[PDB]
Amino acid sequence: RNGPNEHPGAKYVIRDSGDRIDLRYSKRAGDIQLQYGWKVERHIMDNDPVLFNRQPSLHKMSMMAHRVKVIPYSTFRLNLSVTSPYNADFDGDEMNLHVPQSEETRAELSQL
Amino acid sequence: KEKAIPKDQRATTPYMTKYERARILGTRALQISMNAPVFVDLEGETDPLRIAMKELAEKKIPLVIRRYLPDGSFEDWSVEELIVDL
Amino acid sequence: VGQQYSSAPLRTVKEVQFGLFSPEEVRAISVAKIRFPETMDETQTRAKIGGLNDPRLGSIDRNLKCQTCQEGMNECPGHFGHIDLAKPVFHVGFIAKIKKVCECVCMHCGK
Amino acid sequence: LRMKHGTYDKLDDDGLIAPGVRVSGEDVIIGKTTPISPDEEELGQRTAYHSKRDASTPLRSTENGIVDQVLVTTNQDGLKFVKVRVRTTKIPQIGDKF
Amino acid sequence: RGPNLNIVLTCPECKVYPPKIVERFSEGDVVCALCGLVLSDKLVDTRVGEASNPLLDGNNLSTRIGKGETTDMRFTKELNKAQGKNVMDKKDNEVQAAFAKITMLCDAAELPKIVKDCAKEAYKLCHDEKTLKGKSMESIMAASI
Amino acid sequence: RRLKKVEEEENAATLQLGQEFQLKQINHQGEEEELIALNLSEARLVIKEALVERRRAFKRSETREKELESIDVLLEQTTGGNNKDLKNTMQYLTNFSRFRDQETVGAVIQLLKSTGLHPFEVAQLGSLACDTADEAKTLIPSLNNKISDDELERILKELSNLETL
Amino acid sequence: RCSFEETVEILFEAGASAELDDCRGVSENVILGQMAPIGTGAFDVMIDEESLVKYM
Amino acid sequence: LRFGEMERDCMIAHGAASFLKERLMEASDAFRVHICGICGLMTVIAKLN
Amino acid sequence: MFFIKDLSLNITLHPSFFGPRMKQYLKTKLLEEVEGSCTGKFGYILCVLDYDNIDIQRGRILPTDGSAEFNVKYRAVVFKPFKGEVVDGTVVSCSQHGFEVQVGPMKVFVTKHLMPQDLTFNAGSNPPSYQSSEDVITIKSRIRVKIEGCISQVSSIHAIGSIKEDYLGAI
Ligand SMILES: [Mg+2]
Ligand SMILES: [Zn+2]
Ligand SMILES: [Zn+2]
Ligand SMILES: [Zn+2]
């Protein structure tokens, strides 16, 4: 109901048959009635495990899994104590973020 | 089946590994998310991963880990009989 | 949307065996014989039959189907053609190997 | 045919936005059309009515601002070409480098 | 006179023909503008390739032979010699030779690129016709210019 | 690993039944066994013997027309959906079966097994009604030069001797 | 081996010698896009009917 | 964004085999092809309709 | 021809059926996915024998699918056609190209070129039928047909028969 333009929201609805319904252009017919086994592609929320990386990524501690915390402004934010393993400073460095797409990878990422 | 070691002479570690625990929780969490029957009493919980953790703690996961050996032989270990010490 | 459902069993690749094509295999595997060094007909409207971009080898456009498997661009893996060389030619990556084999056997009886 | 999903409302009869008009992402700032050959149907939707295909230049997705100057002239070969300049203001924020 | 081999995207649910289709280039999706159903995914954009104009040269793919980081003059000379002794390319070489002279003539008078493109196109269209067989090549080039 | 990609053409006349239908078969246990071929009447008995057993499992936990209806009602009750193919088989077997009860088939099996013929051939012999040795020699080319007309003539007579109804 | 250096040369030698690859390494599985037999992939997770029945 | 070889190496060290497959298959190019049981070549003409 | 064969199948169970009575669901799936199905390697699988004693091996959980893959070994009755075999059937449909004979779970098509010269197509009669001096072939008629060729696909089998040889055709 929130739609794809209001966080927290959703962008796509995938039925059990594999059909994908775009939330945009779909409100004219009203909200879709969900059924068990369907997939709702929703915006990453707080506490969602994500993989945070910085190249060249010379060792395994340069790529670690974090918990999402949606915030204002256009910059990533991370604790100071975890900068040494990443070998990163805040003089302009950029870091990459990856979002797991399955429960298995979601649990694997957060437990290892 | 000469590649299946009988339970009487299993020589692998009786402790579930971190990798085994990670996959067991993920595999069970995925099944729960796809409307699988929960075999543990729920005191209020919606996250499939958390439900899986509760099942592992009470040893109510009906899965067995087939540990492979570098020659093709394997040993079957039930999740219930594997000690979770890590 | 994804690819359409298939009735063939789903399996995982277990072994990879490398080798060399036999001339018979290339002719049998191929779906069309290339004989024209052109790609489009005189009207530049549709691909010429027998040319490099023969419709039988597959399609790389979202609006055209493959003439062999009748599938779109997202499902057709591509179909191999063949060219019948007038005379045998060496393989650039095996010239060194060919030379060693030539010096290993007699050049008149193959022993 | 193949017109962009953006808005062409800001363009004038000459296919150029008059300077001073505010623009945003996906806004078309230079309108251009080219003729197409018949006997070419893509995803259907290609009828006898359609005789042109869009060749416009859209504004950058992440950029926005106000069109400052639009200049029209001819090149060495006599072909008409235009230059469009867009003004925008950058205010320091939590990500800027100093 | 041949196989159709045409793909038309229509929404199975809406069934309206013709359908309203919006191509979301940013999201790489083709979606029905009425119900929101996605009709096709993983659309491609529209170096390793060369662009040639099939109006002045038609369909003619050829590759030259030249020296590299390491090369012997013997192979280059003979390989170029072999390429010249081709019967299929001889017919088109005359047209190509005509274009080369036209470009030199047009470039010696300081004319825009559009003129030479038009002049070359005019030559190709009027070439290989029975009417233009008793006229000097100089007249043909001048008339095309 | 050898991709010889050479296969002999299947043919009933040459008794080349294929690669998965070889005479020497391996059961699920792993012991070698001979291929078992069933005639039209034998298949009818075996199939409906399992259907009645199937009916008993779920419950626990005659002329052609009346028999056809009894099988039809039994078929739907004891089988799930998409049974259109099974219905056609049972209807086809009832209208082309030559042996009704188990006793007749048991005698037939004990009869034809003395010839030592291939399982495919014996099943064909118990499946198609032949009146003369020539009739079986042409409709079943594999029989040629495998059994003398003297034995075949009496076998056909005895097969028709115990003909049903 | 072709993933490190001399990619084409190694592949040519494989064709001539008809080398067989068992796909027991990480590189083979990464190229083929299948779960490598490492970490969480060094074993198969199976279903236990003996314990499933006694749970309920 | 590029998930380079060095990034792949770190994930192999972490033991997240399943996640590595997901990045390389579901988050990137994924294609289904038909192979022949005799010849291991992707030359099977499949009329799925 | 009907055979009893030892067959194996790979069944997939959704996690929704991972309950105390999951084995029964596997049995139901076997009867719902095998019985009445067609296979090019084993022919038409008609009936499953020994329904109480199917050998079900331990299931393997798929990496990303989340469903369990079970290998199932069972005994079933299969009808497998072969070229050169002689079968009996009932005509179901008639057309100018030929008539179709129903033989158990299979439909055999008899082409005109595989038909005796005397037989001719007559569309004037309702229903259309092939008429000849000695006999007439129509729908519901019993025809003895010899299978001349068989083409087997992974999930479909089609065969063509002939009645030109002696002792074939109308019974
Ligand atoms: Mg820095
Ligand atoms: Zn194709
Ligand atoms: Zn629609
Ligand atoms: Zn093959």
mmCIF file of N, CA and C and ligand atoms in Angstrom, chain C residues 56-59 66-71 76-79, ligand 2:
data_model
loop_
_atom_site.group_PDB
_atom_site.id
_atom_site.type_symbol
_atom_site.label_atom_id
_atom_site.label_comp_id
_atom_site.label_asym_id
_atom_site.label_seq_id
_atom_site.Cartn_x
_atom_site.Cartn_y
_atom_site.Cartn_z
ATOM 1 N N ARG C 56 19.151 -18.748 -39.527
ATOM 2 C CA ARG C 56 19.152 -20.086 -38.953
ATOM 3 C C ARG C 56 20.130 -20.240 -37.796
ATOM 4 N N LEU C 57 21.109 -19.344 -37.667
ATOM 5 C CA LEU C 57 22.101 -19.432 -36.606
ATOM 6 C C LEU C 57 21.636 -18.810 -35.297
ATOM 7 N N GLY C 58 20.520 -18.089 -35.299
ATOM 8 C CA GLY C 58 19.997 -17.431 -34.124
ATOM 9 C C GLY C 58 19.742 -15.970 -34.396
ATOM 10 N N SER C 59 19.237 -15.277 -33.379
ATOM 11 C CA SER C 59 18.906 -13.865 -33.486
ATOM 12 C C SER C 59 19.457 -13.124 -32.279
ATOM 13 N N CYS C 66 14.490 -16.943 -33.586
ATOM 14 C CA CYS C 66 15.440 -17.826 -34.247
ATOM 15 C C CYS C 66 14.702 -18.758 -35.197
ATOM 16 N N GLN C 67 15.210 -18.876 -36.424
ATOM 17 C CA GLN C 67 14.578 -19.737 -37.416
ATOM 18 C C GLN C 67 14.754 -21.218 -37.111
ATOM 19 N N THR C 68 15.619 -21.575 -36.162
ATOM 20 C CA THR C 68 15.879 -22.969 -35.828
ATOM 21 C C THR C 68 15.057 -23.449 -34.638
ATOM 22 N N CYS C 69 15.127 -22.742 -33.508
ATOM 23 C CA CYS C 69 14.418 -23.139 -32.301
ATOM 24 C C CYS C 69 13.174 -22.307 -32.023
ATOM 25 N N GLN C 70 12.884 -21.296 -32.841
ATOM 26 C CA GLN C 70 11.677 -20.485 -32.682
ATOM 27 C C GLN C 70 11.594 -19.877 -31.285
ATOM 28 N N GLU C 71 12.726 -19.396 -30.780
ATOM 29 C CA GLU C 71 12.799 -18.792 -29.460
ATOM 30 C C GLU C 71 13.413 -17.403 -29.555
ATOM 31 N N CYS C 76 17.437 -18.457 -26.926
ATOM 32 C CA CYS C 76 18.236 -19.149 -27.932
ATOM 33 C C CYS C 76 19.714 -19.058 -27.575
ATOM 34 N N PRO C 77 20.415 -20.179 -27.377
ATOM 35 C CA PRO C 77 21.850 -20.094 -27.073
ATOM 36 C C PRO C 77 22.717 -19.852 -28.294
ATOM 37 N N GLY C 78 22.163 -19.936 -29.489
ATOM 38 C CA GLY C 78 22.930 -19.795 -30.707
ATOM 39 C C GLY C 78 23.221 -21.146 -31.335
ATOM 40 N N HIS C 79 23.218 -21.175 -32.665
ATOM 41 C CA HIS C 79 23.432 -22.398 -33.424
ATOM 42 C C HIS C 79 24.619 -22.212 -34.356
HETATM 43 ZN ZN ZN J 2 17.785 -20.723 -31.826
#
